[PDB]
């Protein structure tokens, strides 16, 4: 048995495009991703997701919808990363580059999988189909998946 730390991940998914950010430093640097980070004490997971979206992309949204949960394990790290994944289609300002992230829109036939975390190839298609999911991925380093599980669920 392992302990887990809470993280959020937010995808702004519109009918023809999705907003990603190029991570400029830190964990996952060099990969396009949604926006997110560690949940803080006292806030709900959804509110931590809203906060991270604002801090990293400049976008302020009233509500997010939970679409999945993914647990990450790394060889040599005792602590699991419990990532709660949220979407919205509804925004009302422009993204702005932060120290963490350079936002960029991608058309939905140009999802930059080769420059995303390798596990995203498995679960992101479910997100695009508006399905809900639970996943688990064990990584050796940044690139290599040793074990994983992915399941569609009716309730996250
Ligand atoms: N798409 C995708 N996202 C992931 C994976 N693993 C993983 O931690 N994430 C997300 C969850 C968080 O949004 C982010 C990791 O949190 P972070 O290190 O950016 O947290 P933070 O903003 O609190 O960090 P910092 O500013 O203190 O350095 O990456 C993955 O394999 N695929
Ligand atoms: Na952050
Ligand atoms: Na972050």
Quick one: resolution in A? 1.2
Bridge partners (DSSP) of residue 86 are: 10, 66
- Ligand 1: which atom is nearest the Cα of residue 137? 31
* Ligand 1, atom 30, residue with closest C-alpha: 117
Quickly name the fold that domain 1-156 has: Nucleoside Triphosphate Pyrophosphohydrolase (3.90.79)
Method: X-ray
E strand segments, 14-119: 17-23, 32-33, 65-74, 80-88, 101-107
Is position 8 annotated in a ligand binding site?
yes
Token reading at 66: 């939970």
- Ligand lying nearest the CA atom of residue 25: 1
DSSP string, 14-39: -SSEEEEEEE-SSTTTTSEE-B--BP
* Ligand 1, atom 16, residue with closest C-alpha: 37
Phi-psi region of 50 (alpha: psi -120 to 50; beta: other; left: phi over 0): alpha
Domains of the chain by residue range: 1-156
């Amino acid at each position: 048995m392992k302990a887990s730390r809470l993280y959020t991940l937010v995808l702004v998914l519109q009918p023809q495009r999705v907003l990603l950010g190029m991570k400029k430093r830190g964990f996952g640097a060099g990969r396009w991703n949604g926006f997110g980070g560690k949940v803080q004490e006292g806030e709900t997971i959804e509110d931590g997701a809203r906060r991270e979206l604002q801090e990293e992309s400049g976008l302020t949204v009233d509500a997010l919808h939970k679409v999945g949960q993914i647990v990450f394990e790394f060889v040599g790290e005792p602590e699991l990363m419990d990532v709660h994944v949220f979407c919205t289609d509804s925004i009302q300002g422009t993204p702005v580059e932060s120290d963490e992230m350079r936002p960029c829109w991608f058309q939905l036939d140009q999802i930059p999988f080769k420059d995303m975390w390798p596990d995203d190839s498995y679960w992101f298609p479910l997100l695009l189909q508006k399905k809900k999911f639970h996943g688990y991925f064990k990584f050796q380093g940044q690139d290599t998946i040793l074990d994983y599980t992915l399941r569609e669920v009716d309730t996250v």
